[PDB]
């Protein structure tokens, strides 16, 4: 019961930043140039970049879930 509450509490502040993280990923992956589309390597680099930029905010929220779970 406590774990789900703190997650909702975390979504109050961390969720807004997570919403910003999702906003940036969609905006970048939608706005592509002619040079970026025709290069396979550049697509994978942005795929890794969007992947890693997601991890940091997601890890913080899940850590906020883990820390309250032990306590």
């Amino acid at each position: 019961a406590s774990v789900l509450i703190v997650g909702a509490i975390s979504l109050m502040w961390f969720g807004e930043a997570l919403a910003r993280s999702l906003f940036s990923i969609m905006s970048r992956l939608f706005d592509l140039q002619r040079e970026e589309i025709f290069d396979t390597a550049k697509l994978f680099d942005i795929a890794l970049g969007a992947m890693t930029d997601l991890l940091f905010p997601l890890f913080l929220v899940l850590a906020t879930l883990f820390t309250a779970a032990m306590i």
Partner: protein, 89 residues
Amino acid sequence: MTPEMFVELFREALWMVLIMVCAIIIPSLLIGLIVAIFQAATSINEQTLSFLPRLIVTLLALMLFGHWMTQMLMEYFYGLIERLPQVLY
């Protein structure tokens, strides 16, 4: 083709999928035991704390073995093309 060619092809994919999945789930499995013995030491019966360490290590495995896995499958796609004339011979 021949029944033996199918088994050769079937095993190679089965060996490939086994290697592809094992590299990622091995680190998560070990971390699960490490969290399990930690919860055995403190006698805490919570079962949701272990999700985060497995998820973090799983992404770490994907980042470390991402190039190797993609290259292995890409070369596997080329390998079937190379052996395609042999089957159609």
